[PDB]
Amino acid sequence: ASRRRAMKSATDNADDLIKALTLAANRERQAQITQEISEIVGGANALA
Amino acid sequence: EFFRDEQGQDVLLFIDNIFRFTQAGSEVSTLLGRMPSAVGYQPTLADEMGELQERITSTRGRSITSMQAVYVPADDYTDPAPATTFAHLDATTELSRAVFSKGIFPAVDPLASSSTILD
Amino acid sequence: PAIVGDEHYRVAQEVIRILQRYKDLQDIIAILGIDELSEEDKQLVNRARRIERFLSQNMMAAEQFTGQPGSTVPLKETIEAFDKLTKGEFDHLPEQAFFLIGGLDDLAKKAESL
Amino acid sequence: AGRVVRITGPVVDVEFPRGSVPELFNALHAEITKTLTLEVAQHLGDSLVRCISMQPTDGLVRGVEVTDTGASISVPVGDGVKGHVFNALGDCLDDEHWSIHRKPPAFSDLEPRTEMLETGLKVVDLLTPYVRGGKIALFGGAGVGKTVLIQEMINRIARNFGGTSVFAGVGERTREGNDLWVELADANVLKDTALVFGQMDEPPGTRMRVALSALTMAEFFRDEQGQDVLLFIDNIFRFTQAGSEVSTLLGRMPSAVGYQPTLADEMGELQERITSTRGRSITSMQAVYVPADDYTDPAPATTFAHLDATTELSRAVFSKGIFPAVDPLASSSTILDPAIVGDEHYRVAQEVIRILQRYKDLQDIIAILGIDELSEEDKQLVNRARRIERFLSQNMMAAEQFTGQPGSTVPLKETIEAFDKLTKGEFDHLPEQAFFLIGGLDDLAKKAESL
Amino acid sequence: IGTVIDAGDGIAHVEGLPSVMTQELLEFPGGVLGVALNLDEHSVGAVILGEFEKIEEGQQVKRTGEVLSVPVGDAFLGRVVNPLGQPIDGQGDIAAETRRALELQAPSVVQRQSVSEPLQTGIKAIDAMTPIGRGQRQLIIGDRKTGKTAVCVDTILNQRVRCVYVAIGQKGTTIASVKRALEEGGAMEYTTIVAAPASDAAGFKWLAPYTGSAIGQHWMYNGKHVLIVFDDLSKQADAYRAISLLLRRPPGREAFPGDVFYLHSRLLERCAKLSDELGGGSMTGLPIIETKANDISAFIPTNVISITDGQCFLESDLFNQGVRPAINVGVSVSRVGGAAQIKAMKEVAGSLRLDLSQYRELEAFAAFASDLDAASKAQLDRGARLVELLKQPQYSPLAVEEQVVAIFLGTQGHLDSVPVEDVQRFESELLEHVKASHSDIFDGIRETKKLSEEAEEKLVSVINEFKKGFXXXXXXXXXXX
Amino acid sequence: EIGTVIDAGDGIAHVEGLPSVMTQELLEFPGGVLGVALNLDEHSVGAVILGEFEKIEEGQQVKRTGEVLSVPVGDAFLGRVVNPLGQPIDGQGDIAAETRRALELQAPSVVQRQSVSEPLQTGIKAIDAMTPIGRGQRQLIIGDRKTGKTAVCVDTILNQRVRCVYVAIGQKGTTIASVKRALEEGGAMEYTTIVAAPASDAAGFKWLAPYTGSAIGQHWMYNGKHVLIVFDDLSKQADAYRAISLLLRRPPGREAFPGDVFYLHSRLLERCAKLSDELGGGSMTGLPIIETKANDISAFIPTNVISITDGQCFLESDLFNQGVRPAINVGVSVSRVGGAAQIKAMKEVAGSLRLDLSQYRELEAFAAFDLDAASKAQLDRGARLVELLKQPQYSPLAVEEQVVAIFLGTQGHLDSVPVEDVQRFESELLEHVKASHSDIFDGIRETKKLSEEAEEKLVSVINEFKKGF
Ligand SMILES: Nc1ncnc2c1ncn2[C@@H]1O[C@H](COP(=O)(O)OP(=O)(O)O)[C@@H](O)[C@H]1O
């Protein structure tokens, strides 16, 4: 009965952890794309 | 729009896929020589989409109901492309394989699917 | 140890040690909790949480924000307070007693009310 | 004769008389106010030639005379090259000359190699066995253990081999070059080894071409004399790095992760020349740097395509103290099939990988819960997996200064039998420390008693 | 006639050629060819299809008056050629008068028919779950050393339909080993090998797919079936990126040009199933993409995924764990589906996908043995055995009739008595027995394209008899209970 | 020859004229401010200003010196504080030295070197034992802010009481003053040169600061004398060069850095070497520093320097806060020279010490997740070894004292004693041996080895002391 309670909370916490990391991943994913492109375009504009 | 305005009747508009317009927008934007925005999209992403979506609207005479398909890159709803689209939209119909496998037609997911006007 | 003396340096680092270990166990505590930790770790976590809340203090400028007036704690009071916390003299007191207090007298006074 | 117009680092622009413009990749000499060798790169227009310097451009002046040789950078070739030290330009650093630039062999001339090169190392022979006349790659992060491994492979294999060798120090430590010189001198293997050096000290122009000079020498040993040649390159990444440096200054728009747009092309021209032909074969042992421990990086990502065997060194395994720190899952070999290496070897190799893979999957669960929640079967698999990881560790002959104990060489038969017994679970009683840093099975049992 | 002003990095700016066509073949004075891409105000940007070491400022370039075209025919079968169509193998010249342009428009909406003809790869995992039809485009995507090329080679061997293996940015020794593999199997006779290796310029890599497609189209329009393999488009994309950046075209996402999607679009679309009016020929495509750390979200992967008619995602974790081929069932899809399957396979592998979807959901519970009920336990035991059937050794394509029997065995629960580790050997020995004795069952499936009620009862008896004979490798044997 | 400035701003100046100007030539503006001709264009000369450019304008006259960048060198610089150019800032008279050296000089060739087999004792147990540094070696000191990077370098300099060269780049003045004050207290300033290019100074000074410090050290190196140089730090010098390159309009790459940012650090560090017997046999050890952000080793500039240097000493924040000081991560940190840069005494006792502690940290993590006997003993041993490696700030220990302390732990003489009492046991033990058994220390100093007699002597001394403790 106590395990049921203990592992139920653990699962609910795991769900929350996944959501926080997934957002952080997408934050980084979008950022890395944005950052790389700005450096590439920056070098292109330098010449012409 | 002409079927809407002149004929005076509720017309259906089926778009598959609306994302590919935005994708095409990015492709031309780069070649034209516009500096890219967030996640390498065109700077006029919201504007291009805005001009299209706003035309799809109900007039006093009659309406046009748009049933659109929308791609979500990387299963990422935070991505600018799907993020901007969601602002324009009223309703969603999520078809699930679980309900299709049972033999329930149409296999609309009753929990996941939603509508803004349900008030 | 040259400027601020050996005692202050000893207490300062000892507090950091406890808070560091607490932060390391955050990942494990997030899923499982306090129950799966050992007897020693259980006590360290209890002390760490109480130390975190004791570091909180009433600000003189923040009367409009909090409501209660601010409190100023001398160096001698500070050193002695964290000395007793590290040794574990205030293990009996609740977590709410440490929240938003200056001196040691105010800790004991709020402890009775709760 | 020409005249210097513009100078911007190791890039130099030169004017020439209309109609007498040097060809591409042609060596141009210029007197310093020493002789600086420039190599042609681009034709800007109005009889202007953009060139890449092969030495520092400090002391140059605008309007200085530049002589055209009328040919690409030439380097010495033959038996005289053996037991000597050279630079990128092909000048003796110890106090016929063919061009470095040349097309790769035809498809008809290329032979597919399917022969085992027995190293002696357990991790390599089992999981990623190297090929005679193949291309072998030591992938690793920053300061992990690439040079120590390449020195080991030299030490083990080269002595026993009757063929000659060619070492190419592309953009590496001059200190390590001095250490290598003394190491080869003591072993008395200098006589059957040619050395080429273009260390990180030198400009990017050298690091670009230094690889070609060493390769050209090896190609003649292959083609003409008809010899099975060894080619040691450390590090191949530094060529690609140098490629990026020149590319930016020339005024090419950068590609992904700020690399040159012609990354795959530059690499392609070099790597394809390094091949074993039907007539005569060449075994290339290359070292490869992996920036940011990132295998997705274009530089290491492109290199992978060229290689027949690969050895991926990971920091996680290095941090444990497992030497050599070869990633058993990531690392791969083309020859690992039942046809070449027999059904038994293939069976044991894959079975070891299966156990290590499952262990890696359970790391996340073990981190939180532990061993207790795992089943009886899983508990045993984890125990075996840990023991297998530690058995893969081995004493290196080169690493006497590091470890202390002398190195050990393990034959193929010993390797196969050892991992056979481990998978079956015959050594379940023995402790974890018994498997750490041992060669043969006798040494396992001997250390088991002491503990 | 025109004169070169600038030259370097496999690019050349040309003065003159006032009335030059776009994508026109130019000839430098050393015999090296070029392609006029950018027609500027006072220059012509040209990419060199060859060595540019003896191409200089002042050298004379002439017009051919032709857009890129390459010879085609039956002569190319069993030959190894470059994009231009020159043989590298060294087995004489290519005798063929018929030619085709590289850039040609794909079949229109009206000039197509719905794909309803199976193309059997001979791989249980693919044929059953993610079937490929004649005219379909099925992407093979995954990390390095996941078994992408292996699947394509096994597919080509199973056709023993004309094959066209296009190699882009590959090392020579790999292309040689692929050719050697085809010779051993004896599948080279009906296989054309287009090769643009790493040493070659970017132009060759850029052209390599278009040349391979053009060769296949000749058969397609004549009313014959073709299979083309791009290995791989990742490197061809990288090649085009290099060209565009050298020509000073503005970069976008991941330093790629705007028309990097458009590059792959025109290529893949040309693969189609023509109408009955235009013969009714086909041209199946198996493009490949090399992901980095299983990143499906990346720009180039997403582009090709959105074009192709389903994908076969290979995983590293699965490959290392022993699941070979390492096809992720959940992510991988076939857009054509049952239409590109014979009725026999459709029936048996109709609810195979459902059972394995339930298995993966349950899988977590499997470790905790005998803590569950009966229903879930049976599903785990069934699912575990089904995985072993989907496993298949390299260079061993199975016939369709052999696959249906193997799946029918597992799905109906004939392997439940047999241990999980002995499933692979049970399958092999069973097929050998049926091949020898009960060939009529295989013959029935070949002709009728369905499993009869007679054949079902026949198989049951054959299985039961074999179980008794079968000596279990691990521990004691077990037939039935 | 004479030239005129056309453009000026941001510490950059375009010059008309100077037709036959050399590359990297020293130019002199009419206010007395110096400059460096980097870019020799068709009809202009791009120059970087090494000073204040507030009174540098369009029309101002610039002259040639006819010399590539050079800086004075000698014994005069010892106990002085100077800028990159070599002008004293301390205010203790001028630098009397006729001898000069060029900043840009080629490093020793392959033939003009000898294998590093001479220990340079930092006086830190963690470093000397696990990650030893030899004379001519390059050992990177990398980690986050307030991890104890500078502290290690200062302690190293104090232990040499070998010429020292503390190069400060992008540092605040008060920090450089406190470092100088620390050297005065210890009494290590007399043999220490302090090159300083603080934050206020232009990018040019920061860019030059390492090359000037190296040039000063090379004078001793070629004369056949040993040197130690400290770059604090190359992270800021990289940032300075990035600024210059971007102002000159050079195309940026990864993390907005130029292509030759790796090449910048390469030529600098390589000049640090151990010369051959033919060229005297002098040395020049390097201790470069890199400031990581959130323990990001994967970053561009760190990876560049890591790939150049001969081993790294990665400091961690978590370890530092937890009480492990110095906070050297054993698993990640490495010495490429290794045993060669250790005396025979240390080599024997601390032969497999780094490996044992790498296994300990692995097991420590796995221990958290009923164990047997073998693993338990390793954890108890490992835990005690960590306490020995802990060392207070500004307290370098002699090599003979270290070997005894490590020999104690490794052989398992501290197994009986509690873990918390290991630190006091070490201190009191050394005091006993210093007083009574000085002959054991003296033996190790001279022979550089532990004799079988000395081993048995130590064992008896330990056992006797344990009873008294
Ligand atoms: N089904 C399989 N069973 C066993 N081994 C396989 C299978 N498929 C591939 N392999 C082996 O694994 C390797 C995979 O490498 P490769 O085909 O180059 O993958 P990719 O083309 O994705 O890089 C091949 O060399 C092959 O020998």
Ligand SMILES: Nc1ncnc2c1ncn2[C@@H]1O[C@H](COP(=O)(O)OP(=O)(O)O)[C@@H](O)[C@H]1O
């Ligand atoms: N071994 C040590 N033991 C105790 N404290 C130390 C030790 N090393 C450094 N410190 C302290 O830590 C702080 C940071 O040292 P510092 O060398 O300035 O690090 P960083 O160079 O990363 O800023 C200083 O205040 C110093 O007194």
Ligand SMILES: Nc1ncnc2c1ncn2[C@@H]1O[C@H](COP(=O)(O)OP(=O)(O)O)[C@@H](O)[C@H]1O
């Ligand atoms: N097999 C090994 N055994 C023991 N120590 C090793 C081994 N490989 C590497 N090391 C340690 O790590 C260091 C890294 O070596 P090196 O190959 O020079 O670095 P890089 O990978 O940057 O070339 C070695 O000098 C040594 O101290």
Ligand SMILES: [Mg+2]
């Ligand atoms: Mg190295």
Ligand SMILES: [Mg+2]
């Ligand atoms: Mg492949």
Ligand SMILES: [Mg+2]
């Ligand atoms: Mg500091």
